[PDB]
Amino acid sequence: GYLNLINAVIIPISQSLELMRNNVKDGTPNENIFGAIVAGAALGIATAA
Amino acid sequence: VDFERLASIGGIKGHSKLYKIKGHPTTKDIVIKLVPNLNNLTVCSEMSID
Ligand SMILES: *[C@@H]1O[C@H](CO[C@@H]2O[C@@H](C)[C@@H](O)[C@@H](O)[C@@H]2O)[C@@H](O[C@@H]2O[C@H](CO)[C@@H](O[C@@H]3O[C@H](CO)[C@@H](O)[C@H](O)[C@@H]3O)[C@H](O)[C@H]2NC(C)=O)[C@H](O)[C@H]1NC(C)=O
Ligand SMILES: *[C@@H]1O[C@H](CO)[C@@H](O)[C@H](O)[C@H]1NC(C)=O
C-alpha cells in the first residue's frame, strides 16, 4: 500500500524531468559554444530561471 | 559563374568537392614517461642512467 501510494507521486516527476532533458539538445550551429540549445516550440512559455 | 565563356577563354570546369572542415573540441589526456623502466637489467646496468 505504501508503494502504491508513492508510485502516484514518483512517476510524473520522472516524466517531467525526462521531458526537460528532451527539450534540450547538445548541438552546435557553426562556431557555437558546443552546448545548450533548446527548442522554442518544445518548451512553450518559460522564464530565464 | 558562366562556364561557356570560361570555356571560350580556355578554362574547363573540373570536379566539385566539399569543405567539410573543423569540428567539436572534445579532448583527452595522456601521460608521457621519459625514463624507461628497467627491471630485468638490475644485474649489469652500472650508473649509465645518471
Ligand atoms: C523523449 O525522447 C525519447 C528519445 O527520442 C528522441 O527525442 C525525441 C524528443 C524526438 O526528437 C525523437 O525523434 C528522438 O529520437 C523518446 O523515446 C522515443 O519514443 C518513441 C515514441 O514516442 C519511440 O518510438 C517507438 O518505437 C518502437 C519502434 O519499434 C515502437 O514501439 C513504436 O512504433 C514507436 O515508434 C522511440 O523508440 C523512443 N526512442 C528513441 C531513441 O527515439 C521519448 O518518447 C521522448 N518523450 C517522452 C515524453 O518520453
Ligand atoms: C624479468 O622481468 C619480468 C617482468 O618483471 C619478470 O617476470 C621475470 O621474472 C624477470 N626475469 C629475470 C630473469 O629476472
First to last CA, chain A: 37
Q: Are A21 and A35 in contact (CB under 8 A)?
A: no
- Distance, in Å, from the CA atom of B45 to the CA atom of B30, rounded to the nearest integer, reads 29
Q: Quick one: CA torsion of B7, B11, B15, B17, rounded to 10 degrees?
A: -110
Number of neighbours of residue A13 by Cβ within 10 angstroms: 9
Q: Are A48 and A35 in contact (CB under 8 A)?
A: no
Nearest-CA distance from B32 to chain A in Å?
Answer: 29
Nearest CA to ligand 2 atom 9: B40
PDB experimental method = cryo-EM
Enumerate the residues of chain B whose CB falls inside 8 A of the CB of residue A36.
Answer: none
